[PDB]
Amino acid sequence: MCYPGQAFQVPALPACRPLLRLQCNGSQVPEAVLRDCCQQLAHISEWCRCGALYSMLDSMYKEHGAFPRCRREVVKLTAASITAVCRLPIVVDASGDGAYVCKDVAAYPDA
How many residues line the site for a second copy (CB under 8 A)?
28
Q: Is 61 in the site for a second copy (CB under 8 A)?
A: no
Q: Contact letters (x/-) for a second copy, 66-105, by CB under 8 A?
A: ---x-x-xx--xx-xx--xx-x-xxxx----xxxxx-x--
CB of 4 to a second copy, least distance (A): 24
**Cα angle 102, 94, 106; round to 5:** 15
CA distances for 99 relative to 3, 33, 47, 50, 95, angstroms = 21, 23, 11, 11, 12
Site for a second copy contains 109 (CB under 8 A): no
Rounded to the nearest 10 degrees, what angle do helices 31-43 and 16-23 cross at? 130
Q: Which residues bind a second copy (CB under 8 A)?
A: 23-27, 29, 69, 71, 73-74, 77-78, 80-81, 84-85, 87, 89-92, 97-101, 103, 106
